[PDB]
Paper text:
Enteroviruses particles are composed of single-strand RNA (virion RNA) genomes encapsulated by an icosahedral capsid of ~30 nm in diameter. In this study, we genetically perturb this equilibrium in a non-enveloped virus, enterovirus A71 to determine its structural basis. We isolate a single-point mutation variant with increased particle thermotolerance and decreased efficiency of cell entry. Using cryo-electron microscopy and molecular dynamics simulations, we determine that the thermostable native particles have acquired an expanded conformation that results in a significant increase in protein dynamics.
Particle conversion from N to empty capsids (E) follows a predetermined protein unfolding process that can be mimicked by incubating the purified N particles at high temperature. Accordingly, native particles of the WT and K162E were heated at 52 °C for 1 h to convert them to inactivated A-particle or empty E particles. Heat-inactivated particles were reconstructed using 2D class averaging and icosahedral symmetry-based 3D reconstruction. Particles then were classified according to whether they had Coulomb potential at the center of the particle. A-particles showed density, but empty particles did not. The WT A- and E-particles were resolved to a resolution of 8.0 and 14 Å, respectively. Even at this relatively low resolution, the A-particle matches previously described structures (EMDB ID: 5465), with a cross-correlation score of 0.918. The A-particle capsid proteins expand outward, the virion RNA genome becomes reorganized, the N-terminus of capsid protein VP1 is exposed on the surface of the particle, and VP4 is lost.
Residue numbers in the entry:
A (entry chain A): 72 to 296
B (entry chain A): 129 to 296
C (entry chain B), D (entry chain B): 7 to 37, 40 to 235
E (entry chain C), F (entry chain C): 60 to 174, 177 to 223
Amino acid sequence: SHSTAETTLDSFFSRAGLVGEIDLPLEGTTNPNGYANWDIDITGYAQMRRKVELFTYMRFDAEFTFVACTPTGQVVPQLLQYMFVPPGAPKPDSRESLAWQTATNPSVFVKLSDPPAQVSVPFMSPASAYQWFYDGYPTFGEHKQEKDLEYGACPNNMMGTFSVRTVGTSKSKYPLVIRIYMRMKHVRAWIPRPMRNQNYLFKANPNYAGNFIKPTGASRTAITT
Amino acid sequence: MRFDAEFTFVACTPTGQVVPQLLQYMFVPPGAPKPDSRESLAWQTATNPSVFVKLSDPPAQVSVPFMSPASAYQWFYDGYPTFGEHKQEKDLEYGACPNNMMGTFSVRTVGTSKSKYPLVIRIYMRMKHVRAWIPRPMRNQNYLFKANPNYAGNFIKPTGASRTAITT
Amino acid sequence: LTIGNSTITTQEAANIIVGYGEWPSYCSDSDRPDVSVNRFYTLDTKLWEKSSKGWYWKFPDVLTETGVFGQNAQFHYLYRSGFCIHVQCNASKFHQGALLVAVLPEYVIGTVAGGTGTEDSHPPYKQTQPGADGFELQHPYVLDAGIPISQLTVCPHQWINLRTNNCATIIVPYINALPFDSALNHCNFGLLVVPISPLDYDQGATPVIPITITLAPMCSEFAGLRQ
Amino acid sequence: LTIGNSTITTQEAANIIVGYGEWPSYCSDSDRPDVSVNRFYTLDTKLWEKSSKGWYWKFPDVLTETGVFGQNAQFHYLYRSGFCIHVQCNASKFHQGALLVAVLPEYVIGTVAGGTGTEDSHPPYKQTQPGADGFELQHPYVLDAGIPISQLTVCPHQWINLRTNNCATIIVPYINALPFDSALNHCNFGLLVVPISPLDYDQGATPVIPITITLAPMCSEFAGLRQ
Amino acid sequence: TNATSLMERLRFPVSAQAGKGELCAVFRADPGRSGPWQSTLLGQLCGYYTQWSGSLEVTFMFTGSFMATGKMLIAYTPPGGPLPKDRATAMLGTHVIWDFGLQSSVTLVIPWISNTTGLVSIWYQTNYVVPIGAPNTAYIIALAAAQKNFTMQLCKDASDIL
Amino acid sequence: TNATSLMERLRFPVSAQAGKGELCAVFRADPGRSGPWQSTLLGQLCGYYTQWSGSLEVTFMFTGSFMATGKMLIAYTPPGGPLPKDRATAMLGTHVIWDFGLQSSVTLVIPWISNTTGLVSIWYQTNYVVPIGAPNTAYIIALAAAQKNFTMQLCKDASDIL
């Protein structure tokens, strides 16, 4: 090459896109308790996991901002403050849990009229870095023949969740619409692996079906031009 | 010429009253095709960067880079615009060639239900860098078509103020 | 040097004027046939009439069929050479006239919208390659290009004055948008001529004035590549 | 270097043997295109059969229609270039054979006198330009030239032995009677091939042997003149 | 597209029955467009991008019998020239000699490709013939890579999935 | 304004029939106002602007017959002086001699023009006479340019289109 100033790596990775969507129904049947918990599950969606699966060894912090509005784009003066529970502590199950009274958990409160919120959280996972693949048995216990009582629900791998409540004596009477954007701050990778070509059947397993697919069949016949 | 762009968006009422409504803007690269129907996948694309700002803050200043695959924009082209090896037939997408422009923006309203107020928006345009090489004349007569400079059979004259040239 | 009975040249003491000190040269930055290219052939003669308004040609479209090297270059899109143009008007002491000659880069062709309905059809196949016949002007304000004639002065130009001299030469530099670009896909330039003095003369004079077009590559090329 | 899917060459460590210390060189006594001549194109493949007796071609008559520079050279009679010929026979361990290759200058063509009446007619127009089809031998003692096959050893020759090597190259010098002579009027030379071993093999082997003709100008030319 | 024909996909067979026909017809070299290039890594990388340029190289190795003799030739037609109707139009372009004594050291380089362009075609240079007691069918392996001069200019907001 | 009179616009004819009359009457030199100056580049540039100042120069070349003899004179009246009723009032202003042996080396410069001002008029210095066997009509070409001392001070929010 001759000049590599315009070819800067800055544009090679930085792309903001919609990743999550959280709804707050005022009544419902799926969530009739009026509160929901959303763990950070990158593997939940296929379209984002395709970019991430090219990477094997990574550790980084996160930055999120929250916006709420109406389907017509009108703005309303509502204030929220967000509280985070470390992943080590178990997540609340019922409203009468002690997680809402914990004062030892740090919190940061910002308004909406101010410039957009910029918050960062450190890497608190006890491991060194996240591992997307594991050629073995995920449990790190001395027992290698039985299974844990909490099989299926293993929050020991994720990074926790957030709790949302409304300020006021009575419950809020407006549902909100919120969209979330995700990004990486540092990019460092070691072992390059191929991505996926066919579609996914299950959310947590890459298994396939008996109807095989082909990358392309554009050429009617190879014998002719 | 090749340059970046800076835009700010203002919305209000015909009486000048202000309302507390928030919008966030998402941009699709020109390479990807533009959506046609509501059920397109363009609204779910997370890989496209976005920047969100409020209205009570100082006016928004946003800049986008030059992403066109060419070196610089060309207003005139003394030939055939298509850059394909075929030089005798015509492409299936003749007439609609988004390969020359710089893309568009998608606007949606935040909320479960659709918005119930129409808005009025005006846009201002400017250049940041000015650099020109080959000077050409401007236009004198009016335009008949939007994409072609063709003219009609009713010719015009720049001025006829002088009643007669013979006298003073 | 020329096989035939015509080896006419334009003296040896011409007056070349450089423009802004950027005379054409060789770009050989990093960011043998020389026998048959130096020979010039004279194009056929043409008869000028009273009703003639002018002519225009597309380059290098004319040389594809004329030149010997033109035929085998139809599949080799590469070409790069500068040209020297000499204009002279053979006239006696009983003729008046003035000539305006200039080069207009990217001579765009604009369509016309006549009749009660402003709708135009596709150009026919026969008119796609007019050859030596060319075309005929309809609206000479625009010269089939939408440009007022008076404002062409922005480009390099020269005034033909018959008071003192008769033959003049203009030099133009080769211009391109990319370091390597196709020649058979992008039009290089064109030639424009406009008559200023209508042909006026008395009986006994010559009613026909020869029109001379001279092509001579003042800057030699190496060429030879796949483009 | 070659547009396509064939850029086959014959190594870089060939064994060139000079003849009598008179290797071809430049005659520049007194008593630039160099880009498009150095590229070699591979001729089309041909299928060898059991009944084939041989082929012969006239030079440079074959290149008039094949080469790109061949077409515009039909009116330019001048041509001067040496050639390097590489011959190789792709065979496995179940094939036997031997090849005799030589060049015969001024390969004269003799007519035949058959039938009860020794009178021959003029050759037809179609057979004047056989192209790639060529001709068919009738009396192979004379090879259509009146020459016994055994006595061709007077000219430069080489023996193809499959015991050790498979590919051989022979070099011949350009010869002419005058310092400047027409090329399209006087035949330069020709190629002769004679089969020594009839094709013998057992079932399961390849019954077809490719025939490779390679042209490569080992001595570059300037050329460019009126001749 | 049959299930029990899955393994044979990775090659293309060649037989001596065909005589001086046509081996393979590579489509226009464009990673963005459909064809053989969608499986490659660079073509997927270009799915968010518009303008590309670089050099192309092809490598071929010969896997025939130990006694066979013959000559293969692979040539790339330069731009401007149309599809080769005759081998004469192929020879005017750049060609490389492929001997059976040298396996893979042969390298062909296309100086510059961008986005209109040239075409590449592969004919039977000569028929592969073997005597009795030899297989009548063989296979050919091809290689394709790019040089260091590949660069990117403009990003695009386009996603090919799904 | 006729269609078939389009080409003759670019010049103005002169004939020997007229005797000591009046050739052309240039209007007040003002690019902002209407007149011949609206076609020029500077006048269009001034359409967003108010105050201008600079120098003016005019060049004339003679295109008569080879045997003709005579004298032409072009003079610009300085400011203050009204329109010239007589040639005596014209001579007091700056005048330049125009011989037929010198074609275009003659240069006239107006020191300073702003925005009231002077006027320029062109009379027939003498009638152009030719003997038998010569054309009775000729044409004259004029030139106009500005010096380096042109400057701009104040921008205006005015658009002349449409």
